[PDB]
Design a protein around this ligand. Structure first.
Ligand code: ADP
Lengths: 49, 49, 41
């Protein structure tokens, strides 16, 4: 997939990653465990919702 | 819901989020007076739903 | 001046944030008071 000079994108899964020379790791994330009838409020800062 | 509570019921003494619909009673202390001017104090209870 | 409502927004060129004043005591009603239905004391 092609990216542009300011993009962000999340990489997930069971895998092994080495950073490219033109890619920056900015953060590590964990899936948040949720039982049925339990949740969290998320904001999409791109669209505001 | 801000509700009345107390022996001689006062407004704004209880607060709730659910309305208890179901059959209960509440109890009040009244002061009445007779055609003879005998001042009486009553203990009453009201079965409601 | 206009109100812009609803989505994430970047002020374009030659646009600035505008402060909206409220008449004396209006602010308390809006926040300190808020709902009159929930409590009346
Ligand atoms: N969350 C609620 N929703 C609806 N009614 C309620 C709630 N909590 C209490 N009540 C009713 O409000 C009344 C408050 O009076 P209370 O002081 O409890 O009377 P008593 O002196 O008989 O205990 C009670 O009868 C109770 O049934």
């Amino acid at each position: 997939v092609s990216h542009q000079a300011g993009d962000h994108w999340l990489i997930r899964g069971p895998l092994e990653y080495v950073p490219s020379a033109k890619v920056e790791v900015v953060e590590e994330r964990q899936a948040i465990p949720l039982d049925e009838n339990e949740g969290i409020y998320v904001q999409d800062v791109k669209t505001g919702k | 819901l801000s509700l009345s509570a107390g022996r001689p019921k006062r407004p704004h003494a209880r607060r709730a989020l659910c309305l208890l619909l179901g059959p209960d009673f509440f109890t009040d202390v009244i002061t009445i007076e007779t055609a003879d001017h005998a001042r009486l104090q009553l203990q009453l209870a009201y079965n409601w739903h | 001046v206009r109100a812009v409502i609803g989505s994430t927004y970047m002020l374009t060129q030659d646009e600035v944030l505008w402060e909206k004043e409220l008449p004396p005591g209006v602010e308390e009603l809006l926040n300190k008071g808020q709902d009159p239905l929930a409590d009346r004391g």
